[PDB]
Design a binder for these strands. Structure first.
Ligand SMILES: [Mg+2]
Ligand SMILES: [Mg+2]
Ligand SMILES: [Mg+2]
Ligand SMILES: [Mg+2]
Ligand SMILES: [Mg+2]
Ligand SMILES: [Mg+2]
Ligand SMILES: [Mg+2]
Ligand SMILES: [Mg+2]
Ligand SMILES: [Zn+2]
Lengths: 87, 150, 129, 184, 81, 208
RNA sequence: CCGGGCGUACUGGACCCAGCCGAGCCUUUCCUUCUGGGUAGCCGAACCAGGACUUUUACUUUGAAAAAAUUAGAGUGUUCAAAGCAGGCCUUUGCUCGAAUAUAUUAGCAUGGAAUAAUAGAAUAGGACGUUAUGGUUCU
């Protein structure tokens, strides 16, 4: 959100859930931010270099967070043939 | 669902997606028609002809073979009954209940069921008059019902 | 019985979107449902949707992307004059800068902003934001 | 005489010349005397091939269907690098306007939806359609998908791409043919 | 399950569904070619037949109707068409 | 994606089946259905250990992303897992919580063992419900070793395994410790045999 | 895109990116017409003006109509204001802006459109076209 002259009058552009695209509120204390390390070709974890996902507290409360990570990580190559689109 | 009950059953037939005759079907559109007329003269209603066709002749649907529905073929050959089959069986059941009621006067359950059947007759007979299947002056009479079906 | 297939379709979409699902199955289909979905798709509130032909009224599978706050019908489809469109957008939309009231006009199904552009009005059909 | 049109083109004559040659073998001769066609529409498809559309009077369609499987195979031999299909010349009646003068009620077989579905059925004749789907892409365009039965698949399995462009030429809309139940 | 392919259900789970609850409803019944033991005559019989079908040659009942599928008599072999 | 050296090796697969890791509970909840390969005719559900292996690798990569190793908390209320979490903390530098979890350890900031972990790892969602519940109050992601009957509420990464096995618990913890050290570079490569034996991390009765 | 104090209105100049409101033509898609103009190009639409027919609505756009006063509202130093429809000019043997404009709304009228919701049609065919198809029976 910005005014007519173009300045971003918005403070706190919030984060969004990686699974459901809901806005994660400032006091949503059930929301987490998963940080997953990148691994080089030697099998070593690369220091300070991560793939990051965010989940709203709503998704975690229903117990669908585990199945959502299976899907999200498989699309990014972090996993193979563990989550199936067709059930 | 179930106009005259509290039931919610969904059992019915599920027509296949294919609207064409099966590849293994060899009878012609004519041979089915003469088969239908042959069975129609034995007194079968369109429901019973269709049951016999799939049960004993492999005719999955008369429409996918001949091109017309079964009642449409009978009406095209002057073999359509005067009373539609479903209205006939409702009146016949009402006749059976009314005959049972005069000998069992304390059967208040049969009196309740008879009202349902007759209410079902009037709704259906009223529809048939708007579509000009029945004459506009056609009326169901309980006294003279036995003549129509017996 | 089933008196409004559009109401059934939008209710299913709302229930799937509120529950975080990214897809929903709609039965039965119709022209009004498809043209209503196209308006939602045009403004980005839904993704691609797919029509399945079953030699019947049909079925639709819609992909949801989480941007949809609420879509709904207005039953009955009230007659709306051009001077009445402003009053309807005030009651149904969260703000004056986004959201759309869907109308059925003789020029076709369109949002309230497009209706002002082509200067047409019809019956109100629904909303989306 | 095989051509039901006045001033046939050279291609129509050549095709009718083939039609007066396949009855030489008596296995299929008792039926090629009455067979006639109205036009031969030909378009160019990618890959160096050319699509050949034989247009047939709709009442005569069921006679062609009895020998079409064989007849195409030899017609593809006589004309190499040609994909041969048989279509019936169905008539499309325009939707009446509100102010239009009253005519006879338009039968459904004459509607544009029925005819495009009908030519979509004549395109894949040896196989039968077991399902149709329509995708509505975010861009605005719409794509049909037609699913074909695996039975008699070998008659069309090397084409299908000719059908998609041919259907696009006739109607202007996009379709994609898929056979979900192949061996693969 | 929030994300799921509704357009391509697993064919195993698709077959356990009720006949009206598939993507496109489809009957699970079929037609059969019935060989009675006494003779050899093709007779097309519906799987869920409601009639006591008899073959043309000899007036012997081939099947008896039941609540669901018709029950073939002893010595009768069926082949799905 | 991932190098092929990270694939499930036959040696680890032999360990998982011999430790009865693949035995999942009789009744499976709807959220754990994708992890079931087939139901055994007695009633036990067979765990797709190929999926189990990949979740282990994914879980170890999240642990390796925490800068301070002590900020990772490993928990076990079951007696079968108490020895495993204590040795995991020793090898990896994590903070073990064996036995009773004092309610308020994450929310009550005046308790004795008041911790602020960036990540909580749980042996069983059912018997460690208290530890999982408070993590949902202070934005703590949860990795859990889940059986087919284990609840999946507020669990982000689920490791499908047998929670009610003496050897299953110890083996899964041993595998995580080895992989975390491999990513950190403590283990030189993915083929070198680790000095520690899976017998360590196994619960011992007072008899011995 | 020379903007000749963000200015930036004005406006020479867009060369229009895309977008938006249109109009026709072609895709199997044409007021069946009737009478001229009138005939120009083939071997009556080539646009008007004068006739002949027409499934019924609902809905929505636009227009005329819905008296003045009242309401909203433009202008105007009644000394301000409530009001009023006055008034202003170098001082006038007179010159001269005005007294707007919106709103009405069910019913009726004319009009564009044809989504939505109804309605009628070809089933014992007593169905449609033959523009110059062939006769017959009546009627003006
Ligand atoms: Mg029901
Ligand atoms: Mg009722
Ligand atoms: Mg039924
Ligand atoms: Mg968009
Ligand atoms: Mg309100
Ligand atoms: Mg708005
Ligand atoms: Mg929005
Ligand atoms: Mg011969
Ligand atoms: Zn026999």
């Amino acid at each position: 959100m910005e005014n007519d002259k173009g300045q971003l009058v918005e403070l706190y552009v919030p984060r969004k859930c990686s699974a459901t695209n809901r806005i994660i509120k400032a006091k949503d204390h059930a929301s987490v931010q998963i940080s997953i390390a990148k691994v080089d070709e030697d099998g070593r974890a690369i220091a300070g270099e991560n793939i990051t996902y965010a989940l709203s507290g709503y998704v975690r409360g229903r117990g669908e967070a585990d199945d959502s990570l299976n899907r999200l990580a498989q699309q990014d190559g972090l996993l193979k043939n563990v989550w199936s689109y067709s059930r | 669902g179930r106009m005259h009950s509290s039931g919610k059953g969904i059992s019915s037939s599920a027509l296949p997606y294919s609207r064409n005759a099966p590849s293994w079907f060899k009878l012609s559109s004519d041979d089915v028609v003469e088969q239908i007329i042959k069975y129609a003269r034995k007194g079968l209603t369109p429901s019973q002809i269709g049951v016999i066709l799939r049960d004993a002749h492999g005719v999955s649907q008369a429409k996918v073979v001949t091109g017309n529905k079964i009642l449409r073929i009978l009406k095209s050959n002057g073999l359509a009954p005067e009373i539609p089959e479903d209205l006939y069986y409702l009146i016949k059941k009402a006749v059976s209940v009314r005959k049972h009621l005069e000998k069992n006067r304390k059967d208040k359950d049969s009196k309740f069921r008879l009202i349902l059947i007759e209410s079902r007759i009037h709704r259906l007979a009223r529809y048939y008059r708007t579509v000009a299947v029945l004459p506009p002056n056609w009326k169901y009479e309980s006294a003279t019902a036995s003549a129509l079906v017996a | 019985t089933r008196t409004s297939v559009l109401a059934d379709a939008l209710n299913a979409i709302n229930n799937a979107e509120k529950t975080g699902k990214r897809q929903v199955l709609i039965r039965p289909s119709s022209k009004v449902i498809i043209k209503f979905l196209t308006v939602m798709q045009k403004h980005g509130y839904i993704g691609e949707f797919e029509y399945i032909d079953d030699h019947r009224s049909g079925k639709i599978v819609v992909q949801l992307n989480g941007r949809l706050n609420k879509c709904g019908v207005i039953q009955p489809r009230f007659n709306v004059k051009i001077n009445d469109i402003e009053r309807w957008t005030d009651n149904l939309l969260p703000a004056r800068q986004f959201g759309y009231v869907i109308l059925t006009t003789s020029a076709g199904i369109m949002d309230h902003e497009e209706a002002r552009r082509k200067h047409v009005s019809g019956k109100i059909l629904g909303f989306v934001y | 005489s095989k051509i039901l049109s006045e001033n046939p083109t050279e291609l129509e004559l050549k095709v009718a010349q083939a039609f007066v040659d396949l009855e030489s073998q008596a296995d299929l001769k008792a039926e090629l005397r009455p067979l006639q066609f109205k036009s031969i529409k030909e378009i160019d498809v990618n890959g160096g091939k050319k699509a050949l559309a034989v247009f047939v009077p709709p009442p005569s369609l069921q006679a062609y269907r009895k020998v079409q499987t064989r007849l195409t195979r030899e017609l593809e031999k006589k004309f190499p690098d040609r994909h041969v299909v048989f279509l019936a010349e169905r008539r499309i009646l325009p939707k009446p306007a509100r102010k239009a003068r009253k005519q006879q009620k338009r039968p459904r077989s004459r509607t544009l939806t029925a005819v495009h579905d009908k030519i979509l059925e004549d395109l894949v004749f040896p196989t039968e359609i077991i399902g149709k789907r329509v995708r509505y892409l975010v861009g605005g365009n719409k794509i049909q998908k037609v699913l074909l039965d695996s039975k008699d698949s070998t008659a069309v399995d090397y084409k299908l791409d000719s059908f998609q462009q041919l259907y696009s030429k006739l109607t202007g809309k996009q379709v994609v043919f898929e056979i979900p139940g192949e061996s693969h | 399950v929030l994300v799921q392919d509704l357009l391509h259900p697993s064919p195993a789970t698709e077959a356990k569904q009720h006949k009206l609850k598939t993507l496109v409803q489809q009957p699970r019944s079929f037609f059969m070619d019935v060989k009675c033991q006494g003779c050899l005559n093709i007779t097309t019989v519906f799987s869920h037949a409601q009639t006591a079908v008899t073959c043309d040659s000899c007036s012997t009942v081939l099947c008896t109707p039941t609540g669901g599928k018709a029950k073939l008599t002893e010595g009768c072999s069926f082949r799905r068409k | 994606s991932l190098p092929a050296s990270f694939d499930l090796t036959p040696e680890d697969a032999k360990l998982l089946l011999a430790a009865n890791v693949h035995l999942g509970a009789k009744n499976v909840q709807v959220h754990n259905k994708p992890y079931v390969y087939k139901t055994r005719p007695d009633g036990m559900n067979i765990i797709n250990i190929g999926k189990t292996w990949e979740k282990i690798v994914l879980a170890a990569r999240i642990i390796a992303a925490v800068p301070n190793a002590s900020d990772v908390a490993v928990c076990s209320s079951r007696t079968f897992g108490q020895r495993a979490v204590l040795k995991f903390a020793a090898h990896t530098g994590a903070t073990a919580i064996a036995g009773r979890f004092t309610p308020g350890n994450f929310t009550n900031y005046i308790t004795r063992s008041f911790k602020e972990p960036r990540l909580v790892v749980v042996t069983d969602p059912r018997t460690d419900a208290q530890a999982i519940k408070e993590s949902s109050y202070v934005n703590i992601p949860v990795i859990a070793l889940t059986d087919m009957d284990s609840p999946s509420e507020y669990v982000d990464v689920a490791i499908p395994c047998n929670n009610k096995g003496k050897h299953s618990i110890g083996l899964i913890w041993w595998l995580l410790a080895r992989e975390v050290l491999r990513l950190r570079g403590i283990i030189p490569d993915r083929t070198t045999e680790w000095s520690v034996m899976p017998d360590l991390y196994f619960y011992r009765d007072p008899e011995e």
